C-alpha cells in the first residue's frame, strides 16, 4: 500500500506509478475516501476501453504541448544547384576520414522560405500550417483560401481580399507555434573547431546529422569560400549550452539555456506563451482549500505532495474571463427550450437523488381517513407519483435569469371560477399553497386576483379604469404594469364591501415569504461567474436557517408553515358564515372546517426541508455545474424595482450605431416561460418525511464524495481563458479590416482591402473561429453566438432593466490577451519583412527594357523608375475613355484633368482600371507595349510574386511570360506577377541580349540569402553575402546574448531556453467530519 | 510519445503491515451508483446552437422557417422530449402552451442572413450572379 | 432579385456599375454620373438576428409609380393598429366576460 494517500495497490511494484502523482520518484483525477475502499478515477472522453473508470465529458483545450526540436520557422532552400572544384575535401584522423558538412546549401542561389515547424518532434500537433513553396514555384494558393468562394479564374487571388488573407495567415503562424521547449539530453564534443562545448542531441537515431544544421561554427575553414570566411568572422565560445539550472532531478538538470539555430519571432512567441501559462499555475494546498470551502463544512479534503518547483498546472483565471464566458453561454440560448431543458432535467434528477426528503401521499391518505374530504382527495390524486414539477421548481431558482417558472393555466379554476363550488375552492387552496415556490416576478398579484375573480358578484373592489374589470382572468397578470392600484394600496379596499378580500390582501402583504441569500463556492481561487450579484452569494426566494433536524414540524416561525396556516384560516373564515355559498343544501361547514384544520395541522416536513437543507444542496452543486447560475434579484412587493428585461450588447459605450437588441429581450417575462403543476407542487409540499435514522453528517459526507470525485470545474476554468482569448483575438482582428472605434495599431494598411460589410466580417470571423478550434482541439461551442448578425463589434457587455426604467449595466474588463498581442507583434515583424512570406511592397512597371546589363528586377536602377512627381507623367483615374483616331491619327485616351493623350510617354494606372477593363485595354495596348514606347506603372500596394531564373549567357524573352499574366488578369482575381532574374556566377560569362517587361519600383530582394556561396566570390550577376546582421550574437563581439532587434530583422541564431516540467493529476484524500 | 488528435484539421523482510484488508463492511446511504449516474448525466455540456451562423463559404447554416414559428417549433420539441425524459406520455413541465403570451419571442434561423436581408438564395449564389453580370470576352 | 434568371437584372437596374472603355453616347453618360449612389444606403436594424425593418436603395425606378406606392403605403399606415389596442377593444366589447 501507499503511505501517502493511504491507497492500497494491487501490486507492490505499482507504487512507482502512484507516487508520481504525489510528486515522488522511483488519468485526470484521483479521489480516495477515508471510510471506504472505493477509489474513483477520471479519464479522457476520447479514449477507449474505459473499464472501471469515469468519463470527463467537458471539453479540454490542449494547453501543454511540447516540442523536442529546434524552434524556427524560416528554412533555407537551394534554388539553382551548382558544384565547384574544391581544395580541401575531407578531414583526416589517423586512418579515417570525415565528410565536410556545410550548414547552408551549396547552391548558386539560395533564399529564405517560411515553413512553420519544418524540424520539430511534437507529441500533440496543432494541425495548422504556413508552408511557403519555393518562390520559383507558384505560391498563390495561400492568398486564396479565404473569401474566394467564386472566382472567374482558378490560379488567381482576389486583390481586395489580401488584408484578410494575410491576417488569417499571420493568425495561423501564431497559433501553430504555441509549444513548450522540451529539454533533452546533451552530448560532449571534441572537434578541433568546437572543443569541449556540450552540444544538444535531438531525439531519434538521426541525432548526429543535425549538428551541421544547428551549429554553423562546427564546420571549420577548410578552403576559401563565402561560408568559410563567414564562419571565420564568427566567434568560437558561443555554441551549445550556456547556463544550466541549479536544482536537478536525478542527474539531469531542470532547465538549460542553450545556443542553437532558431528565430527571434518564434522564440519570443514561445517565451510569451510560457510566461502566460506559468502565470496561471496553482498549489495543491490552494486546491484543497477550494474543495474544503466548496464542501460547506460537511466534508474536509487534503492533498499531500512533496516540495518541488517543476510542477506546472494552470487553473487560475480572472473573474472578468469568467464573466465573459458566462455572457457567451447566456447568448448561446437564443430563446429556445431545447438547450435549457436537459440542464434543468438532469439537475432535477441530481437533486432528487441527493435530497434526503422522501415524498409519499400516504400521509395525506391517512390524515383524511376516508363530501369535502373525498373531493379534496380526488382533486389531490394521491395515486400519482411524479414530482418533477416540484424538483424543477427548486432547479429554476439558480437559473431565474434565463428561465422563469410559472403555473400552468389548467391549475387555475377552469372557467374563472366562483366561491360557490367546492372544486373551485380546493383549486384555489392548491394554487395558494403552490404559488410561492415559483421564480415569477408577480406571484402575489395572481394569488390575490384569483380570489378576486372567484368572488365576483358577492363583493366588489374599486377599479382603476373602465377598460378592465374585476372578472378578468388571473393568468393575464404576468407583467408588473398590470398590478391593480387597489392591491397596491389596501386603504382603497373598503372593509364593508370586501371583508374577505381585504383580509386576503393583508395576509399577502404581511406573510409572503421574504427573499434571502447564502454564501457558496470560493471566490479567491475559483473566481466567480456571478453577474448583478456580489461574487460570493447566491440569492433565494425563501429564507434559510441553520440546519438541525430536531425542530417541531408544527412551527409557525417557519414562513411556509405560517403561510399554510394563514391560508387555511382564510378558507375557514370564508366558509364559516355559510354566505357566499347559496345552494349548499346541507351544513357542510362542519366538514369544511374539519378538513381545513387537518390540512393546517398535517405532519409534513417539506417546509422544514426547504429552509434547512435545500440551500445546502444548492450551494454544494452550484460551483460544480457546467452552466454556472445566472440569477436576478428577488423582490416581494416593491414593484418599483421588479426586473422586466435582460439583454446583451456588442458595441462600446462611446459609440452610436444601429440599435440591435439581443433576442433575450423579446420575452414578455424576464426569460423563457416554463410551466409547472400546482397540484404536484402542493402534493409534494403537503407530504414528505426524512428517514428515521437520518444523520446529516453521514448523509452529506457520503453523497458529496461521488459528486466531487467526478468534478470538471478545473476543465471549465481551463476552457474559459481560451474563450476570452478567442473573443479578444476576434475583436482585434476584425477591427483591422472593418471600421470600428477600437484603438489598434493598424500596421497592415499598405495592403489593399475594402470596407468590410456584415457578411464579409461574419465569414472572416467564422474562419478565425474554426482555425482556433482546430488549433486548440475543440469540438463544441467556442465563439459562435457572436457570428449571428453584425460581428463587427467592440466589447462584450450585459444589462437588465427595472420597471421604473433604472437600468444596471455590467461591463467586464478584459486583460491583455497573449494570442492577440503576439499576432500584433508578428504583424509588426511582417511589416518590416514582408518578402520572406512571398509578398512584395510597392508597384510594378510594365515596359520593354532591351539591354545586356545584369541587374535584378527586384532592385532596378533609378534611371528607369518614375512616379507622380516625375515631370511629363500622366495619372489616370476612374474616367478613362479610349477614342480611335480617324484617317491615320493616333488613338488617344483621356487623362484625369480632361486632356486626351496619345499612346506614348509614361503612364500611371490604378490596378482597378485594368481590373475592370481587362479585355478592352488588353486588345488595344499589346501592340504598343511590345513594339512601341509605352511605360505603364500599375499602383498595387502589395502583390504575390513568383520568379523564374533564366540563363544569362543565352538569349531570353519575357513577352510570352508577361502577355500570359496580362491576359489572365481578370476582374475578380490577380495572377502572380512574373519576374525574370538572371543567375549569378563566378566565372566570366559571355553576355547575351535579354529583354524584360516587368520590374519593381523599390527594393524587394531582401529574402535572398547568398549567391554562389561555394565560390570564393561573385563576379557576374547580382551580388550577395551571408547576412551579418541576422547572425548578430556571433558576428558582433560587444553584444549580450539576450540582445534581439525584433521589429526590424529576425535573428537566425538566438538563446533558446528549454524546460522539463511535470503535470501531476488531481489527487485529494476526502475525509469525513465527526 | 504522441497523443492522437480528436478533431479534423488541415491534414485531411517486507511483510503485510497490520491494519490492511480488502474487505468491505459499509454500503453507502445515498448510494454510489445512483449518485454517480446522476452526476454523469448532469456533467454533459450545453448544446451548440449553430443555426443562423455563417458557414465557411458564407451561406448561413440553418433552415428556412420563419423565426417566431421556428422558435415555437423548438419549444414544442422540448416539450415532447421532456415527456420522454420523464417516462410518461404526457408532461407536467411544459415549455409550450404556458399562460404567458409570447408572440414576440424570436429564435435564430436560416431565413435571415447577417446583414438584415433574406436567405431565399444563398449568398454564394448571390455573389456568383453579381460577378457574372460584369464579364467580358475576346473579340470574334 | 428572386426568380430563375437574375444576371440580366443587375446591369439594367444599376447603370452606374458598368465600366467606361470607350467614348460612346452611353459611356459618356456613365462617366458623367456620380459614383456614390448605388444600392442600399440606409437601414433600420431594429433587432439583431432578424430582418431589417426597411431599407432605402438607389435602383432604377419610375417616380410616378414610386409616388403612387408611397401614397398607398401612407394610406395603409394611417390604418394600422397594435395588439395593445386590440386587447382593449376585445375586452370592452365582451363587457368583461371574455
Ligand atoms: Zn499515494
Amino acid at each position: 500500500q501507499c503511505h501517502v494517500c493511504s491507497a492500497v495497490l494491487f501490486s507492490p511494484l505499482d507504487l512507482d506509478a502512484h507516487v508520481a502523482s504525489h510528486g515522488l520518484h522511483g488519468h485526470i483525477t484521483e479521489f480516495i475516501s477515508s471510510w471506504q475502499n472505493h477509489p474513483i478515477v477520471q479519464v479522457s472522453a476520447d479514449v477507449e476501453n474505459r473499464k472501471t473508470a469515469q468519463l470527463l465529458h467537458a471539453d479540454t483545450p490542449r494547453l501543454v504541448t511540447w516540442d523536442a526540436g529546434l524552434c524556427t520557422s524560416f528554412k533555407i532552400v537551394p534554388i539553382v544547384p551548382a558544384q565547384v572544384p574544391q581544395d580541401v575535401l575531407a578531414y583526416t584522423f589517423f586512418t579515417s576520414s570525415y565528410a565536410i558538412q556545410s550548414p547552408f546549401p551549396e547552391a548558386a542561389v539560395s533564399r529564405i522560405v517560411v515553413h512553420t515547424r519544418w524540424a520539430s518532434n511534437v507529441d500533440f500537433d496543432r494541425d495548422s500550417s504556413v508552408i511557403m513553396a519555393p518562390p520559383t514555384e507558384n505560391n498563390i494558393h495561400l492568398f486564396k483560401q479565404l473569401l474566394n468562394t467564386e472566382t472567374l479564374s482558378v490560379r488567381g487571388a482576389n486583390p481586395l481580399m489580401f488584408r484578410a488573407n494575410v491576417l488569417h495567415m499571420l493568425l495561423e503562424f501564431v497559433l501553430d507555434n504555441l509549444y513548450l521547449n522540451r529539454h533533452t539530453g546533451f552530448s560532449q564534443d571534441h572537434t578541433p573547431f568546437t572543443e569541449g562545448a556540450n552540444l544538444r542531441s535531438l531525439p531519434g537515431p538521426d541525432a548526429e546529422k543535425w549538428y551541421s544544421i544547428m551549429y554553423p561554427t562546427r564546420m571549420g575553414t577548410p578552403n576559401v569560400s563565402k561560408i568559410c570566411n563567414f564562419v571565420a568572422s564568427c566567434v568560437r565560445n558561443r555554441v551549445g549550452r550556456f547556463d544550466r539550472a541549479q536544482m536537478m532531478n536525478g542527474a539531469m538538470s531542470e532547465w538549460v539555456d542553450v545556443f542553437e539555430t532558431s528565430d527571434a519571432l518564434t522564440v519570443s512567441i514561445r517565451g510569451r506563451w510560457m510566461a502566460r501559462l506559468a502565470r496561471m499555475n496553482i498549489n495543491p494546498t490552494e486546491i484543497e482549500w477550494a474543495l474544503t470551502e466548496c464542501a460547506q463544512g460537511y466534508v474536509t479534503v487534503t492533498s499531500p505532495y512533496a516540495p518541488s518547483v517543476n510542477r506546472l498546472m494552470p487553473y487560475r483565471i480572472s473573474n472578468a474571463e469568467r464573466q465573459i464566458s458566462q455572457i457567451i453561454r447566456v447568448m448561446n440560448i437564443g430563446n429556445n427550450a431545447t438547450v435549457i431543458q436537459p440542464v434543468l432535467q438532469d439537475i432535477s434528477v441530481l437533486l432528487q437523488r441527493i435530497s434526503p426528503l422522501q415524498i409519499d401521499p400516504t400521509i395525506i391518505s391517512n390524515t383524511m381517513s376516508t363530501s369535502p374530504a373525498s373531493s379534496i382527495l380526488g382533486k389531490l390524486r394521491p395515486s400519482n407519483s411524479d414530482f418533477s414539477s416540484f424538483r424543477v421548481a427548486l432547479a429554476g431558482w439558480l437559473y431565474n435569469g434565463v428561465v422563469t417558472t410559472v403555473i400552468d393555466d389548467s391549475s387555475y379554476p377552469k372557467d374563472g371560477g366562483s366561491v360557490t363550488s367546492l372544486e373551485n375552492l380546493w383549486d384555489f387552496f392548491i394554487l395558494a399553497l403552490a404559488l410561492p415556490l415559483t421564480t415569477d416576478p408577480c406571484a402575489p398579484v395572481k394569488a390575490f386576483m384569483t380570489l378576486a375573480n372567484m368572488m365576483v358578484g358577492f363583493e366588489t373592489i374599486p377599479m382603476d379604469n373602465q377598460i378592465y374589470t374585476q372578472s378578468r382572468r388571473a393568468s393575464a397578470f404576468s407583467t408588473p404594469h398590470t398590478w391593480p392600484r387597489c392591491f397596491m394600496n389596501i386603504q382603497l379596499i373598503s372593509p364593508i364591501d370586501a371583508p374577505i378580500l381585504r383580509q386576503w390582501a393583508e395576509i399577502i402583504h404581511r406573510y409572503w415569504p421574504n427573499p434571502s441569500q447564502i454564501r457558496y463556492g470560493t471566490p479567491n481561487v475559483f473566481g466567480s461567474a456571478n453577474l448583478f450579484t456580489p461574487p460570493e452569494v447566491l440569492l433565494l426566494p425563501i429564507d434559510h436557517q441553520p440546519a438541525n433536524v430536531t425542530t417541531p414540524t408544527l412551527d409557525f416561525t417557519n414562513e411556509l408553515t405560517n403561510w399554510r396556516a394563514r391560508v387555511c384560516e382564510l378558507m375557514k373564515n370564508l366558509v364559516d358564515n355559510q354566505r357566499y355559498q347559496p345552494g349548499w343544501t346541507q351544513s357542510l361547514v362542519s366538514s369544511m372546517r374539519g378538513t381545513l384544520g387537518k390540512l393546517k395541522l398535517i405532519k409534513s416536513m417539506t417546509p422544514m426541508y426547504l429552509q434547512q437543507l435545500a440551500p445546502v444542496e444548492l450551494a454544494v452543486i452550484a460551483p460544480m455545474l457546467p452552466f454556472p447560475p445566472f440569477q436576478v434579484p428577488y423582490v416581494r412587493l416593491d414593484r418599483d424595482r421588479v426586473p422586466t428585461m435582460v439583454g446583451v450588447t456588442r458595441q462600446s459605450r462611446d459609440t452610436i450605431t444601429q440599435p440591435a437588441l439581443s433576442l433575450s429581450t423579446t420575452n414578455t417575462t424576464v426569460g423563457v416561460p416554463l410551466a409547472l403543476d400546482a397540484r404536484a407542487i402542493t402534493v409534494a409540499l403537503l407530504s414528505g418525511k426524512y428517514p428515521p435514522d437520518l444523520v446529516t453528517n453521514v448523509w452529506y459526507a457520503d453523497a458529496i464524495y461521488p459528486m466531487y470525485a467526478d468534478t470538471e470545474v478545473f476543465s471549465n476554468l481551463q476552457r474559459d481563458v481560451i474563450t476570452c482569448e478567442a473573443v479578444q483575438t476576434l475583436v482585434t482582428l476584425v477591427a483591422q479590416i472593418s471600421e470600428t472605434q477600437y484603438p489598434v495599431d493598424r500596421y497592415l494598411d499598405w495592403i489593399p482591402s475594402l470596407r468590410a460589410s456584415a457578411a464579409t466580417a461574419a465569414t472572416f470571423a467564422e474562419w478565425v473561429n474554426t482555425s482556433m478550434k482546430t488549433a486548440f482541439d475543440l469540438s463544441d461551442m467556442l465563439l459562435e453566438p457572436l457570428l449571428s448578425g453584425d460581428p463587427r463589434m467592440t466589447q462584450l457587455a450585459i444589462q437588465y432593466q427595472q420597471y421604473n426604467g433604472r437600468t444596471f449595466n455590467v461591463i467586464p474588463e478584459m486583460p491583455g490577451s497573449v494570442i492577440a498581442d503576439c499576432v500584433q507583434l508578428t504583424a509588426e515583424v511582417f511589416n518590416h519583412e514582408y518578402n520572406l512570406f512571398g509578398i512584395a511592397r510597392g508597384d510594378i512597371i510594365i515596359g520593354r527594357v532591351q539591354s545586356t546589363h545584369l541587374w535584378s528586377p527586384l532592385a532596378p536602377p533609378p534611371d528607369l523608375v518614375f512616379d507622380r512627381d516625375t515631370p511629363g507623367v500622366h495619372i489616370f483615374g476612374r474616367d478613362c475613355r479610349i477614342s480611335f483616331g480617324m484617317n491615320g491619327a493616333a488613338p488617344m485616351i483621356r487623362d484625369e484633368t480632361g486632356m486626351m493623350v496619345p499612346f506614348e510617354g509614361n503612364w500611371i494606372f490604378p490596378l482597378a482600371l485594368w481590373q475592370m477593363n481587362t479585355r478592352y485595354f488588353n486588345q488595344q495596348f499589346d501592340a504598343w507595349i511590345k513594339t512601341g514606347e509605352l511605360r505603364i506603372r500599375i499602383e498595387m500596394g502589395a502583390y504575390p510574386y513568383m520568379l523564374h531564373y533564366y540563363d544569362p549567357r543565352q538569349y531570353a524573352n519575357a513577352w510570352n511570360l508577361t502577355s500570359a499574366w496580362l491576359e489572365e488578369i481578370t476582374p475578380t482575381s490577380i495572377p502572380s506577377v512574373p519576374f525574370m532574374v538572371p543567375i549569378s556566377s563566378d566565372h566570366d560569362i559571355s553576355s547575351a541580349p535579354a529583354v524584360q517587361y516587368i520590374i519593381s519600383t523599390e527594393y524587394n530582394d531582401r529574402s535572398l540569402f547568398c549567391t554562389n556561396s561555394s565560390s570564393p566570390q561573385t563576379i557576374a550577376g547580382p551580388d550577395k553575402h551571408i547576412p551579418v546582421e541576422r547572425y548578430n550574437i556571433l558576428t558582433n563581439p560587444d553584444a549580450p546574448p539576450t540582445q534581439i532587434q525584433l521589429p526590424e530583422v529576425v535573428d537566425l541564431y538566438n538563446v533558446v531556453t528549454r524546460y522539463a516540467y511535470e503535470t501531476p493529476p488531481i489527487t485529494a484524500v476526502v475525509m469525513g467530519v465527526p | 510519445k504522441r497523443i492522437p488528435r480528436k478533431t479534423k484539421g488541415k491534414s485531411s523482510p517486507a511483510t503485510a503491515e497490520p491494519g490492511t484488508s480488502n474487505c468491505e463492511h459499509y454500503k453507502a446511504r445515498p448510494g454510489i451508483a445512483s449518485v454517480q449516474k446522476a452526476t454523469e448525466s448532469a456533467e454533459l455540456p450545453m448544446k451548440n446552437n449553430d443555426e443562423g451562423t455563417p458557414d465557411k463559404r458564407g451561406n448561413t447554416k440553418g433552415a428556412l422557417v420563419n423565426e417566431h414559428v421556428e422558435a415555437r417549433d423548438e419549444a414544442d420539441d422540448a416539450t415532447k422530449k421532456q415527456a420522454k425524459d420523464t417516462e410518461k406520455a404526457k408532461a407536467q413541465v411544459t415549455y409550450s402552451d404556458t399562460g404567458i403570451n409570447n408572440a414576440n419571442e424570436l429564435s435564430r434561423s436560416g431565413n435571415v442572413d447577417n446583414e438584415g436581408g433574406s436567405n431565399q438564395k444563398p449568398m454564394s449564389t448571390r455573389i456568383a450572379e453579381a460577378t457574372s453580370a460584369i464579364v467580358s470576352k475576346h473579340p470574334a
Side-chain angles (χ1 to χ4, degrees), chain A residues 2 4-7 18-19 21-22:
Chain A
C2 179
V4 182
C5 50
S6 83
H18 180 79
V19 297
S21 66
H22 303 307

Side-chain angles (χ1 to χ4, degrees), chain A residues 45 114 117 199 461 495 741 875 919 959:
Chain A
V114 176
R117 276 196 292 109
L199 317 169
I461 53 171
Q741 303 311 328
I875 299 95
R919 291 286 183 263
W959 178 247

Side-chain angles (χ1 to χ4, degrees), chain A residues 74-87:
Chain A
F74 309 91
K75 77 156 170 298
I76 308 189
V77 304
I79 298 288
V80 185
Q83 63 294 310
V84 290
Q86 295 173 357
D87 194 1

